[PDB]
Amino acid sequence: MSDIFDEAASFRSYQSKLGRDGRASAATATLTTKIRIFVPATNSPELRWELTLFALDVIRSPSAAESMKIGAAFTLISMYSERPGALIRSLLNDPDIEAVIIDVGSMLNGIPVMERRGDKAQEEMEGLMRILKTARESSKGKTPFVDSRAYGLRITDMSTLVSAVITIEAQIWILIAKAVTAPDTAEESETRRWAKYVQQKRVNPFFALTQQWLTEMRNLLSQSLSVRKFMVEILMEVKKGGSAKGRAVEIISDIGNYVEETGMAGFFATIRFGLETRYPALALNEFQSDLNTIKGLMLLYREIGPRAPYMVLLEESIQTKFAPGGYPLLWSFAMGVATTIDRSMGALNINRGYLEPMYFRLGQKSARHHAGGIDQNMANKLGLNSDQVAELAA
Amino acid sequence: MSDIFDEAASFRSYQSKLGRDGRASAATATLTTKIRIFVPATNSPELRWELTLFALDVIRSPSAAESMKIGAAFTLISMYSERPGALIRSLLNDPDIEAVIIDVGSMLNGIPVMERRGDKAQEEMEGLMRILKTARESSKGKTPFVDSRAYGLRITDMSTLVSAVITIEAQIWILIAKAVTAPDTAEESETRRWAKYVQQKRVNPFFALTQQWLTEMRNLLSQSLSVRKFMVEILMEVKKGGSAKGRAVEIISDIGNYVEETGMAGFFATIRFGLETRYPALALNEFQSDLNTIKGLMLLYREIGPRAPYMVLLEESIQTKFAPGGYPLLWSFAMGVATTIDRSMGALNINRGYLEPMYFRLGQKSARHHAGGIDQNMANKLGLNSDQVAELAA
Amino acid sequence: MSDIFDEAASFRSYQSKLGRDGRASAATATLTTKIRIFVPATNSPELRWELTLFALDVIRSPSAAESMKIGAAFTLISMYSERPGALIRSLLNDPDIEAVIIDVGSMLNGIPVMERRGDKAQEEMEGLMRILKTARESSKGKTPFVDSRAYGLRITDMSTLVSAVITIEAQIWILIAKAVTAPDTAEESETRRWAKYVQQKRVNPFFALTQQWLTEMRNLLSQSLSVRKFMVEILMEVKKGGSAKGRAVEIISDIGNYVEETGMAGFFATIRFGLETRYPALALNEFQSDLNTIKGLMLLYREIGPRAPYMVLLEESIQTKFAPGGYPLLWSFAMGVATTIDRSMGALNINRGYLEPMYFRLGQKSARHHAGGIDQNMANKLGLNSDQVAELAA
Amino acid sequence: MSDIFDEAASFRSYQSKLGRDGRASAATATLTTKIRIFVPATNSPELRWELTLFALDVIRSPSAAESMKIGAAFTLISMYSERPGALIRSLLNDPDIEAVIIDVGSMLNGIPVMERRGDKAQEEMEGLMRILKTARESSKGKTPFVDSRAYGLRITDMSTLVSAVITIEAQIWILIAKAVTAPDTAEESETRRWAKYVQQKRVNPFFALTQQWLTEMRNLLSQSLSVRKFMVEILMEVKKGGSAKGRAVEIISDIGNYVEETGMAGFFATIRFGLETRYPALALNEFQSDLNTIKGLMLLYREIGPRAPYMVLLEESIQTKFAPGGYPLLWSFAMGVATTIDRSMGALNINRGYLEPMYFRLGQKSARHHAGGIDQNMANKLGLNSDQVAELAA
């Protein structure tokens, strides 16, 4: 009777947030791996420039261990800050790893540890020399930068270093947008992002890394979750307004605009196209279940918190509930109207196992062949009967 | 049901202001670069005239470092004030740079540091001499001013110095309007502004800088963000009324009238044309999402603060959300109606990848062929059917 | 009549806090002197030990400029902290000076500037070498430490560095107690404090500086006010409880226990002895003005704030109002009763020009020959006449 | 007038808690030293017994570094717990040190690190072998235990290990009572404490360490504050009732009864004897100041918190304010009645510089020659006039 179809509505609402309450224990604590991070101790551009040159080689090195590669990645990302050690320690929320910050101090060809020389320090120098030699020999004499003069370049002015660093930072931060969603299909939007900043003159194109190095970094960025967690944490903190933003921060925040809501196009297309833009083909006894599920997802997205846009980047388990497959019918209808309306929408890969072409066809007919679709009019257009016809004539 | 399409609206409203709350930390602190600014210590007209000539030469110089160019620009912008050091120190909000104000004191051909002569001073003296020599040799003997007599001109009267400084400041401040939006397509609106100010006799046309120097300064202004931030801060402070305004301040505010809302013609054109000028073609079930996004953008713009008009100049990350691309349909409709209505609108470059020519055609038709479009009439026009027919006859 | 003698009291109360209200302007801004501070960039024990040895040499140097000596003192005082630059920048309230923090980086025999070598660095290196040579040649080959082996000592263990640094900091901090009150009459209380800390095993006696270096450092500390202000700020910050205190902080607070209320023995002795310890000779119609002045001074001391005990160290102008001379009669009475009562009091130098020997004699008599002086008894001692007689018998 | 002597009472009360408010900053952060702690990973008695044998030798070793000695001390104290690593990490509040817990795993003659053998592990084995060889050679073949059979004893039963460990724990925990107050004058109460537990059969006397080893441990315990802080933290946590107490915990809590209020006998004797046991010789114009100061100290002691009894052990700077010297007169009177009443009181060393024998003599007369001292009688003893005489006759 009347109680039925309302008990279920509460039942489905209760089922979604079934056991996601309370606080977990410390027994389920992941084993931690030591990660050695080489941060610049001083503000001298000559040491900082030599440091970021070293961090570039470690990432490009094929003989480098993964833990060393994460250290180079953490060294690069925090290079812009005046106190990289403080930034890493105050913006790290990775239970998987423990970070041991190492102040570099001075600069040899590699890094001088300068701590009880001879005692457990000599082998580290030999290891780093092997890292540098293998990195340079691995490539065909090709420097990480697209310009061979940008590698063996002497930097002493603070102004040049800041411009040089930001270009390295910006090019790395470009990859996060499509590092885990479709890393192979990248280099098109990434080039478009780089071209945009070049025209804005925010980045000096002289310090442009080659695509060989970018592929190596992107492979590192996809494999490792700790680096992704650190960069997502930076994005959220930078997103919070209130303080003055520097040139490095403004670029990061601008890049974070493209990063948000990545990897969840199937869910958001359903919200924007299938659900909104109210079409008379919604209530058809095959979307009422999906509409109920979608309503629960909106509450779940609001309940998650500030990490909701970057769910795919952090690989949250909540993401699977958001993916199409739990509401294949409405999503199929949503992609039907999406391809017809949005020209860009159509390069999306939607060859899933629950396409349901009949509902896809209905969405295609909904955009054009269904009706003009005049919604509630606050302004009273009594003579708009022909106005719809002219609009419908197209 | 009824809850749907309102839950979704609240969801989009919450998603717009998702994580832009709270206060950030000091860990994300940009590295600062020292910027040396040469300000006049006294009010003697000859010293100030020599100082602004030196600043012009340094800006024109090709061998000048970028920091020196920024120092020269800051010296120029604050020349009108009787206390340039106080003006710079009390109107600087640039975390990227730290300004070390230097009182010039006396004046040689260059500038006498007058601080422990021989100790760390002769090198700076020879550097400034090299700067001046390279600046003079670089051009084909052409002075920065369009009149060769305006360069080697002796100034001893305060009024003449004030007039020349006002002209130089005005000619500098014309460039900010189209320095980052379309610097290449400039020199038309800039020439129009210069002609307008000449016809108003606010600027003496004798001190007119050549177009080569103007191009060099526009390139410098586009490259650097600190100068843009300082000039935007000056514009914001001058805009606040309450006190007496001098000739320099009046000219600066008149220029800032044109400066405001630059680089956001898409959003404001969308508002003014698509949103206002209520057309029966608005409520069409394909514009509701765009209207909701536009409303959220309106609240965001109100929330941003006094820096909202100058977001493109400061390169705020919030600007990307304002750009068309999140509402291409309504934007295309508004561009169509604007191009049909506003004759000047049509020189705008709108060859984007989301043009949607169908909606552009729909807007073009809605502008003219749609109907007369009589809105709510407070005055009762009983017999205005024939008036509407005659108006539609055109 | 009745109103008079109360109008006078209100008049004196208003006169005490006559013009000490409102906020001052920025026009009265002292000229600032640049002070170069060499702080350790890293946590390596060898670098910190070499840095503190260099600071000791610079302080002992006779050819050192005063600014260099202040920089060395600031380097020494902040050596215990893991981030000396942050400690100095966040605990500096000196309008007289501006501090330019310099991260040392690596360390040669002196300090490597490591910033554009050859450009304005070689002269500083030669100056530092001259400073070291003059410091070493000035004494008769006598190292700053009382043990010649403590100077040319290699430090690589963190614990040894911490112990040596704590000892040096403690020996420095002993001097502040009697640096400006009576620097010449020192070396007795200072030696007592050093012996106390040695017997407590808080300080390793191996790193004990010679008395020549201690005299030089005490002279430097008395001459300079910025160092005193910095150390008083450190004392005030450490005094505020709430957080865990390290060995250095505990030693500093224990020394500040002796530091407090220094140089104001006259006022506090007057309070404790003349005002408290109620004697029948107090209300005698020659002490009412002094009592009113003392009450006003107590109100002023409560009004001053947390800087009240260290008024002599900061050389506050309000201190002169606290000194005896505005209440010579009650002060003399209190010093008489103190010299008769307190055995230790009597080594104080009170050969002032307002001794008033009659009141000193009156206080001496009031201490012993006056009466037993039984005050208000909560317990009813009805048979205490014989007890009072026996007590007066002595 | 009446306001005077009440303004001072508030003034002295306000002066005590002058600047002890608010929260300190993190700038004053002590440099941390790494401390390596060898904890047993498993519960096997054979490994635990071999571990505590190793920790005994390290403490006895003369060639051992201080940091190693602290690690042995931390290893011993936490040996009773089933999870020594959890106990140390959850009961450590030492900002001076950082503890790196090392699970021992298996057991060779020394300790097998078992982590990448050959890589930075071989030298550690050689160092430990040097530690063991020097420790055994330093003594004249004397084992740490008073019984030579207790050293080379095989332990496989859990029951024997628990009894053996507790004896080692109890003997170490005896020293804390008089480790910093008067370490030289120890071995009398310490032997008395040990004899008491032997008669109670809580400790098996077979595992009794020689006095040569106890002196070495006590010297370590006095020098190092980190060990004292850890053991004080254990005392407070064990003091908090609510849970079941094991044999190890019960001994520690029983020992903590003697540890409490150590090193503050001068203050507490004044409270118990001078202030309490109300004598008609209190109000004499020479104790009113001391009574006021004593009252302020009681509030300060209550304000400190649970760490108030162990102020001397933690070497809190607040302790100096509690020491006699700020109230020498009443303390001298208090010790006067203390020596006459308490036979044990009189072995205390009170040869200070502020003895004031006249007030000491008055205290001596106060106990016996002053009066019987009949206080307020709730029971009405009308015929007690002769009862006092018989009591006074003695």
Numbering used by the authors:
A (entry chain E), B (entry chain D), C (entry chain k), D (entry chain j): 1 to 394
Paper lines:
The first gene encodes the nucleoprotein (N protein) which associates with the viral genomic and antigenomic RNAs to form the helical nucleocapsid. The paramyxoviral nucleocapsid assembly entirely covers the viral genome, protecting it from detection and degradation by host factors and serving as the template for viral mRNA transcription and genome replication. Here, we determined the cryoEM structure of the recombinantly expressed, full-length, and tag-free HeV N protein in complex with E. coli host-derived RNA. Following cryoEM data collection, a multimeric HeV N protein double-ring assembly was resolved to 3.5 Å resolution, enabling the building and refinement of an atomic HeV N protein model.
In the HeV N protein assembly two rings stack ‘bottom-to-bottom’, where the globular N-terminal domains (NTDs) intercalate to form a dimer of tetradecamers. The double ring assembly is approximately 12.5 nm tall, and each ring has an aperture formed by the Ct-arms that is approximately 7 nm wide. The HeV N protein double-ring assembly is formed through extensive lateral interactions in each tetradecameric ring as well as intercalating interactions between two tetradecameric rings. A defining feature of this HeV N protein double-ring assembly is the gear-wheel interface between the two tetradecameric rings. This intercalation zone consists solely of residues in the NTDs of N protomers in the top ring and N protomers in the bottom ring (indicated by the lower-case n). The Ni protomer contacts two protomers in the bottom ring (ni and ni+1), with a total calculated buried surface area of ~ 545 Å2. A clear, reciprocal hydrogen-bonding interface exists between Ni and ni+1 with the residues Lys120, Glu123, and Glu124 where the two Glu residues in Ni form a tab that interacts with the Lys residue in ni+1 and vice versa. The dimer of tetradecameric rings that form the HeV N protein double-ring assembly is, to our best knowledge, a unique paramyxoviral N protein architecture lacking formal description in the current literature.
